[PDB]
């Protein structure tokens, strides 16, 4: 449930709650497995849990705003590479409308779960807005 | 004639080639101190930053709104805020502070806070809190890997040996974009051949590099920049959101990463607002740390070539190293760009971070002969290894750099021409033909390498994304041409997205692919008898160059 | 004779697909008249221009006011283009080759080392920029590195900027510039 | 022939010509920390140290017994050495610790403690403490002068080009003893034309210095030299109590002096009792202390190819700067000597004792180019000049140089050339033609000097100290040939032996002929936000290096 | 009678203190009379006063050991230079017997009065008979 | 013929006004057989002679072996020679032309870089001796110096002086050696 700095690193203490996305375990991520096919590259991925518990281990290093960056992370996880890339893209400078950016809020929170990225694109979409870095031409 | 030879002879020095400048402040061409920088100061109103170095909240920009709500500990701010700078500047040489009691106050002021806290101290004072402040016990080392002709043979080959000579991360660039696919792929089979958990970096373009990191074709990236003011920031292409957004992108692939800044940047892009290079590199700190993201590449790095130009610059670089690493960051310290063509004047830049020693010395040591730099030439290079392995023997200083035999350096780098070689042929790239992989084995640089058909290469690699290659694939190919172990040495590179240790402060992997970061491998200097010291082991590594003859068999 | 640049009007968004379009600084040819090496913005454009036609493809030369950045600059220049291959280059002599469709930061070819251009690699950079508009590979121009250029030119490359930079109309349309023919 | 480019590269890199070898304590070729040094103790009976680091007084030799009887706080050590090591290595890093209590504490501790107490230290340790043990507040810098031809007009004018370069010492010596005098007096005569208060030296022989001295043709002596061992001490022609009575010999006279020892000497001349080259060296500060003598010149200096040839050598270097200032020695800290054929070898050497600081940096830097350098070659001679104000700029470091424009060291040079001429011309000794004040005038070395009939001169200096021609003679002949300016300054040096204000702790003179020392100058480093810090006119003259373009005027 | 740190340096603080062991005051050296003569290099020296001076201020800095080094020097004043030298090669190794020493010391403490010295040299003879560093056979 | 020395018998002083007296190291010749850049210790040793009677003195050879320090070992040489002067010179190549008289640590003329020193040195260093022991004042020979021999002999020079070092022997006196003219 909850990791404490001793329980770091998680792959050499606490291997048995490490589980890619797919959930299956660390240890089926092998060369064997991997000729074979059972594990491909979306298996070779970090899970929600997993990033939970860095996260817990940051924050108990002080590091909070890493924690924080690790769990805002951990909402992008299940979103496909190329949306990650498009709203990514979509956020950097004069590429997106105001409404677009909200638009991209809407689908991180409703149709992602991903409340905190939800927010965090909101927040984006009215800095824009005070500092003109929305397309030109609301 | 009526001039003096003295001063002839002084002018054809080497040094005199460099460019130097006075200050121009207007233009941000100052180091630090600028009569245009902010004052530092602060104000909290319910849980919310309303005021930032002079600035009230409806008075800020991108930066100051993003370091005020995500960068600075409100709840702490205002108190630690209440020191002088000067008291803070004592307590990173006071060896009765802690690391840990500085971050508590560190991570609660502010950009123009931290840079007064610097113009309190001289550079003796910067490397001692330096050796404090360092997050990881046992410092490191990055350099760069890569040619002119964007060679995958010759980068895999210098991997290997740069792998064998203690890189911990190694980083490589394109000359021609198209080929960074080659590039980062010639990469990590070379880095896992010359020293398994070799960390491997592709930078180019944000997009691109994050489609690489995703296609697991690299296992970290650094030069995810950040800039101190809006207007080059939009020239960077990103905002402080875009940038967050895409450290998070990161992180959620289970991939290591740290933003890249460094003093300079705003000026030579044109748009300072008027301010020192050292507080919107202070700016680009905080940004760095309220992104959330662990580490950063910072001391002029790049534009070195700025800071090197006006007065303290120098001084400057060692303390924007300072400030990131004081608000507990990682710190990949430069010294790897050119900026002087004097050996004199290059050796006391790296000494500043050599010296007290930074996770990683140098965040791009040029493994290769400068020549073949493509980031246009690091501080030091492979010419200077001898030099670089003496140093540490001269001064008893880990400089994360050992030496390596002719014999072992020809082996590793035939094996990873080789390996690349095979990985060519399995997956239907253009051919790496024998005469690459013995040239490749005993090259200093693209010299020595036979030309490649470009536009068969670049034609391949578009063919090799559109065929959707990823780590996996080239695990399978190492594989079935005879590379077991490169396989799997590449596969727990990727491995490491699935644990996320990794993504702690500073880590990097030991040959088992074991995560050595600040969080299990703390620093923890409270003076002499305390913190990181040479082990019997490391310092007779240093000591025992070859060449070094023993004294009493002399004749 | 002198390649000298005479602004016109707005420049258009495509002026026919066999083109290519050469997007210069702010205060290329006007405010700024040499690169970093002192090399005349004149005979560069000329370079350019004639790398260009000598491809059998036309060569329109327009300035981009609303940016000062080279990769901007080269890729409006590409989004100008009816080709969709584009040129950029600043007053000290950074030059692109852009491509629209690519992201602004990334490129088809890059020259990076301004110092290290001579009027032989312009000549080059236009033929490969009508190869591209071509829709063909062209082999890239050879990449050219000195590790000392920064250390030698970088402070002055910024100095050059801040001039040019200091020429950025915000959101300035493009404008379109006629080449003529001056005695030497 | 299939090897390594990379390699053969590496393998004709400069460095490795360096004269490198592996440890061989049983011949004391070790830096530091040798098994056979001894551990620290002390014990007193009766006010009396009957016991030093393992040895019974019974077992005591010459050195061991004078330092015992001299260089130890009696009433003290006892307690002093019950500190730990690493403690008083804490101490010396400790901004909450006094300059005068580590004072209270070093005096009183014995050989073998101090090098233990530098064992726990790092390099980064060892220049935060140098700064703070420093004597004199503000660093200095002493030059070397001298040419392949013991050339007066050439010595005159690279005197006075070192003196306006600001050196506030200057060393000659010569390739041929008899032409000492005209050296001495050259040198005299040459730096009061740079600047007023410089002072000179003569570096010969024991008696024939002291002999100089008493006739007013130096202002200070500072190779008066201490062995580590019996053995050398006697083939270094002295004992403790026969240096301890030349020391005494100088201050009767009023002529300030210092000692001169460093890493090395013994197991370069034969006899190292099997100890290192630190420990040894230690011996050789507290007999410097013992002695009462006021400063020391160390830091391996004449020896440096013997300490860094060995591992650790470098660290040793400024380990033993830093033993002799926490002792309250004024440490001239050598960097006066090559010992490699690398820029970036020798650079991270000197900048040990650059950064911290000492009370004269370069107890040596070659003021003319090293081939003219008649003490085998400066760590950093005349060509280094430009690198040396730009290390200055960089590192916001006050170097003690200045930048100097071409036309005033010229005329420098000249007035200079034509004072020595217009002195040799009133004591009647060989011409010197128009020829060779013009030529000094433009010159860099002895290559653009013209030659000169050396017997002739060797003949006119015998005859000149038959003639019992003393300071006051040369200040005479000033006189009288219009160089009043320069009688005066000449007679204002020697007037310091009537005052004895320059034979305290540090001592040298400002422009006025005011001495400044560690007394009226006491360094008071207590952290950042206090000690030496670069005054706004210093600052603004390091960074006003001719060259540097001022930003706007670019085209 | 005696000095303070406040009063260094004393050719600053306190000119008037300070005399030529000749009997000449500080204002006395001059150009003018270094031309005239009537100042010679006899008198461009310190005296023991002076040496004195400058040992309480020394001292006063805790440098006892430097204090001691000028006082002893203050007893070799009015000792002709050329018999300063020779005391000083006397001192050098090898070159006196036992007898020698002890005589020298006996010039210094009953001719010269310089009682420290003469105990210095005492101190030298037996420290040289017992290690070794006597004229071979004396 | 190769130069060699033969072990005579201790040793007197003075043996004719004209004598140069030759001091080589406890080793020279002997238990060492070269110097730092293996120079023969017989061809050395041959050109001090040459020296000494092309200006018409007979060169006379002792083995030092109380020290090993060059100076004293050129003035227990100039101190065994009728003219007062004297050469001293160490396995490693040290000279130094002494004279009795001077202080042990002063000399007439000195050879402080030894891997710098040429036969023509160790011929003229002949000469200007003898012009010396005839009471002449010879132009000394040009000292000559190099920046990167410390760096590059320093230890070295060290490890031949231990050699050196090991054979002294404590008080004993100088040891006449004889020349030996060994068939090639
Ligand atoms: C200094 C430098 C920087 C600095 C200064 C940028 C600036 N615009 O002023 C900083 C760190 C901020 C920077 C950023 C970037 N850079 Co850069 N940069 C360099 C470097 C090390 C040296 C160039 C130099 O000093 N030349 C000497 C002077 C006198 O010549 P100059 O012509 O006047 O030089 C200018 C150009 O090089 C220009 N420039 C710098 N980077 C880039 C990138 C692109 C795509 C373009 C068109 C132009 C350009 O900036 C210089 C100053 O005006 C080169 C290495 C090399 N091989 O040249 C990499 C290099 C050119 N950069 C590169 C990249 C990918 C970038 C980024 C896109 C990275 C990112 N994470 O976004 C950003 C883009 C920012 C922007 N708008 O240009 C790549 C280009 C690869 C390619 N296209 O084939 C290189 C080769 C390698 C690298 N990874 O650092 N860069
Ligand atoms: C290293 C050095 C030292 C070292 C090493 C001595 C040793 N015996 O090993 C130390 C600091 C201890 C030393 C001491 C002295 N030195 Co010294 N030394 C040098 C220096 C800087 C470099 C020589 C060198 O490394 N050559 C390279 C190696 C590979 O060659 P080498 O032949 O094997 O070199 C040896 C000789 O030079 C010898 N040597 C060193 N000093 C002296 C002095 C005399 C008089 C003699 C005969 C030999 C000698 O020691 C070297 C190592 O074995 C020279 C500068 C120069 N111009 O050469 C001054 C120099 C030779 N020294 C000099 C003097 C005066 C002395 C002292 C007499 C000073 C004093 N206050 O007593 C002492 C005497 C000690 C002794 N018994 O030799 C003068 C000679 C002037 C002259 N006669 O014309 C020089 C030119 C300049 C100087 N002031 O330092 N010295
Ligand atoms: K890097
Ligand atoms: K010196």
Chains 1, 5 share one sequence.
Not at chain 2, 455 to 470: C, G, P
């Amino acid at each position: 449930k909850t990791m404490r700095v001793q329980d770091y690193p998680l792959a050499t203490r606490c291997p048995e709650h490490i589980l890619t996305p797919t959930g299956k375990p660390l240890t089926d991520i092998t060369l064997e497995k991997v000729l074979s096919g059972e594990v491909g590259p979306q298996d070779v991925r970090i899970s929600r849990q997993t990033l939970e518990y860095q996260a817990q281990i940051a924050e108990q290093m002080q590091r909070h705003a890493v924690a924080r960056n690790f769990r805002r992370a951990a909402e992008l996880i299940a979103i496909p590479d190329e949306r990650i890339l498009a709203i990514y893209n979509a956020l950097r400078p004069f590429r997106s409308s105001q409404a677009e950016l909200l638009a991209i809020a809407d689908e991180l929170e409703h149709t992602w779960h991903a409340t905190v990225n939800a927010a965090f694109v909101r927040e984006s979409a009215e800095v824009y807005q005070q500092r003109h870095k929305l397309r030109k031409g609301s | 004639m009526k001039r003096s030879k003295r001063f002839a002879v002084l002018a054809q020095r080497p040094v005199n080639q460099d460019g130097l400048i006075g200050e121009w402040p207007e233009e941000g061409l100052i180091a630090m101190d600028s009569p245009f920088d902010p004052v530092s100061s602060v104000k909290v109103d319910n849980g919310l930053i309303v005021e930032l170095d002079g600035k009230r909240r409806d008075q800020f920009d991108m930066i100051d709104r993003f370091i005020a709500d995500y960068a600075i500990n409100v709840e702490r701010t205002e108190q630690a805020m209440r020191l002088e700078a000067v008291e803070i500047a004592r307590m990173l040489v006071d060896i009765h502070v802690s690391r840990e009691e500085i971050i508590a106050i560190t991570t609660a002021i502010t950009p123009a806070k931290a840079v007064e806290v610097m113009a309190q101290m001289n550079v003796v004072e910067m490397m001692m809190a330096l050796q404090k402040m360092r997050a990881r016990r046992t410092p490191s080392n990055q350099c760069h890997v890569t040619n002119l002709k964007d060679n995958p043979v010759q980068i895999a080959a210098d991997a290997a040996e740069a792998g064998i000579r203690g890189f911990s991360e190694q980083e490589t660039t394109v000359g021609i974009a198209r080929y960074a696919p080659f590039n980062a792929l010639a990469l990590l089979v070379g880095s896992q051949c010359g020293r398994p958990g070799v960390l491997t970096q592709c930078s180019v373009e944000e997009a691109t590099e994050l489609e690489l990191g995703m296609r697991g074709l690299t296992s970290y990236a650094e030069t995810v920049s950040v800039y101190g003011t809006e207007a080059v920031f939009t020239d960077g292409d990103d905002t402080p959101w875009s940038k967050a957004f895409l450290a998070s992108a990161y992180a959620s692939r289970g991939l290591k990463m740290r933003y890249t800044s460094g003093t300079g940047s705003e000026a030579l892009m044109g748009y300072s607002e008027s301010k020192s290079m050292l507080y919107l590199e202070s700016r680009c700190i905080f940004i760095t740390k309220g992104a959330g993201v662990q580490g950063l590449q910072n001391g002029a790095v790049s534009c070195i070539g700025m800071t090197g130009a006006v007065p303290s610059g120098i001084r400057a670089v060692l303390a924007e190293n300072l400030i990131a690493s004081m608000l507990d960051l990682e710190v990949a310290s430069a010294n790897d760009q050119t900026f002087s063509h004097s050996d004199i004047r290059r050796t006391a830049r790296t000494l500043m971070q050599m010296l007290p020693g930074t996770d990683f010395i140098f965040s791009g040591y040029s493994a290769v002969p400068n020549y073949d730099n493509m980031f246009a030439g690091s501080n030091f290079d492979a010419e200077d290894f001898d030099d670089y392995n003496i140093l540490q023997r001269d001064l008893m200083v880990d400089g994360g750099l050992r030496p390596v035999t002719e014999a072992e350096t020809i082996a590793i780098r035939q094996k990873a021409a080789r390996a690349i070689q095979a990985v060519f042929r399995e997956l239907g790239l253009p051919p790496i033909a024998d005469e690459e992989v013995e040239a490749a084995t005993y090259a200093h640089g693209s010299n020595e390498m036979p030309p490649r058909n470009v536009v068969e290469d670049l034609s391949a690699v578009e063919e090799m994304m559109k065929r959707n290659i990823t780590g996996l694939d080239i695990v399978g190919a190492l594989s079935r041409s005879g590379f077991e172990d490169i396989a799997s040495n590449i596969l727990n590179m990727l491995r490491q997205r699935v644990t996320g240790d990794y993504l702690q402060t500073s880590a990097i992997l030991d040959r088992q692919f074991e995560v050595v970061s600040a969080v299990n491998d703390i620093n923890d200097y409270q003076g002499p008898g305390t913190g990181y010291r040479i082990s019997a082991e490391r310092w007779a590594e240093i000591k025992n160059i070859p060449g070094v003859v023993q004294p009493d068999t002399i004749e | 004779f002198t390649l000298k640049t005479r602004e016109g009007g707005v420049a258009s968004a495509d002026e026919r697909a066999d083109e290519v379009v050469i997007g210069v600084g702010p205060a290329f040819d006007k405010h700024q008249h040499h690169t970093l090496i002192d090399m005349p913005h004149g005979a560069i454009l000329k370079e350019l221009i004639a790398g260009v036609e000598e491809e059998g493809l036309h060569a329109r030369v327009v300035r981009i006011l609303r940016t000062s950045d080279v990769s901007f600059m080269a890729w409006d220049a590409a989004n100008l283009s009816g080709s969709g291959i584009g040129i950029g280059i600043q007053s000290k002599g950074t030059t692109v080759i852009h491509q629209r469709d690519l992201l602004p930061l990334s490129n088809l070819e890059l020259f990076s080392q301004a110092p290290l251009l001579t009027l032989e690699t312009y000549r080059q950079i236009g033929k490969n920029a009508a190869r591209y508009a071509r829709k063909e590979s062209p082999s890239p121009v050879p990449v050219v590195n000195d590790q000392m250029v920064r250390p030698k030119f970088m402070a002055k490359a910024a100095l050059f900027h801040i001039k040019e930079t200091k020429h950025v109309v915000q959101d300035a349309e493009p404008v379109t510039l006629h080449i003529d023919l001056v005695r030497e």
